[PDB]
A paper describes a structure:
The three most active enzymes were from the FDR-A family (MSMEG_5998, 2850 and 3356). To gain further insight into the function of these newly identified enzymes, crystal structures of members of the FDR-A ([name]) and FDR-B families (MSMEG_3380) were solved to 2.0 and 1.2 Å resolution respectively. [name] and MSMEG_3380 both adopt the PNPOx-like split barrel fold, comprising a central split barrel surrounded by four helices. Thus, it appears that [name] is the first characterized structure of a member of the FDR-A family. Despite their low similarity, the structures of both the FDRs described here are characterized by large hydrophobic pockets formed by several aromatic residues and a positively charged groove that is principally formed by several lysine and arginine side-chains. In terms of shape and electrostatic character, these pockets/channels are highly complementary to the F420H2 cofactor, which possesses an aromatic deazaflavin group and a long, negatively charged, side-chain consisting of a phospho-lactate and a variable number of glutamates. Consistent with the level of electrostatic and hydrophobic interactions implied by the docking results, titration curves of activity versus cofactor concentration show that both [name] and MSMEG_3380 bind F420H2 tightly, with apparent KM values in the nanomolar range (260 nM and 130 nM, respectively). In [name], the deazaflavin/substrate pocket is formed by W7, N25, F26, M31, P48, M49, M50, F64, A68, W76, F121 and Y124, and the positively charged groove is formed by the side-chains of N8, H36, R39, K40, T41, K43, T47 and K67. Also, the MSMEG_3380 cavity is significantly larger than that of [name] (649 Å3 versus 411 Å3).
Herein, we describe the isolation and characterization of nine F420H2-dependent reductases (FDRs) from [name] that utilize an F420H2 cofactor to catalyse the reduction of aflatoxins, leading to their spontaneous breakdown.
Author numbering: 6 to 142
Write the structure that this text describes.
């Protein structure tokens, strides 16, 4: 609904959204419920890979809530997805980033948007915020 308006806005503005997402790199992630089988489209920020053209990182942050978001399980279950980035739409392979690599990519995101550091303080001792790599195929 809201979700719907953010998606229309993304698509009207070359892959950009205002409000809380003003100036941020956005992606619309098409995923499918690992239990329901139902398609959904979730807009979110990404961080582009500094090492590999065609790879973006997304953050299963869910505003520092207690649980991982449903899209996280949907993506890692399917192993592949479709995304809209910029004016494009393409298939992606999904892999989860872990260890010191996760920490480094999360630190760059939190550097650019320090709200991300608050999410991690909110989830301390509860969950580690997953980072996924979406790689263009």
């Amino acid at each position: 609904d809201w979700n719907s308006q953010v998606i229309q806005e993304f698509r009207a503005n070359g892959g950009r959204v205002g409000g809380n997402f003003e100036g941020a790199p956005m992606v619309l992630v098409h995923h499918v419920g690992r239990k329901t089988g139902k398609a959904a489209v979730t807009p979110m920020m990404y961080l582009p890979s500094d090492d590999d053209p065609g790879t973006i990182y997304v953050f299963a942050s869910k505003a520092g809530a207690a649980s991982n978001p449903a899209w996280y399980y949907n993506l890692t279950t399917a192993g592949t997805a479709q995304v809209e980035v910029g004016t494009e739409t393409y298939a992606v392979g999904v892999t989860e980033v872990t260890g010191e690599d996760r920490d480094r990519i999360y630190s760059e995101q939190a550097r650019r948007y320090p709200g991300f550091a608050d999410y991690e303080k909110k989830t301390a001792g509860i969950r580690t915020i997953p980072v996924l790599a979406l790689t263009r195929t």
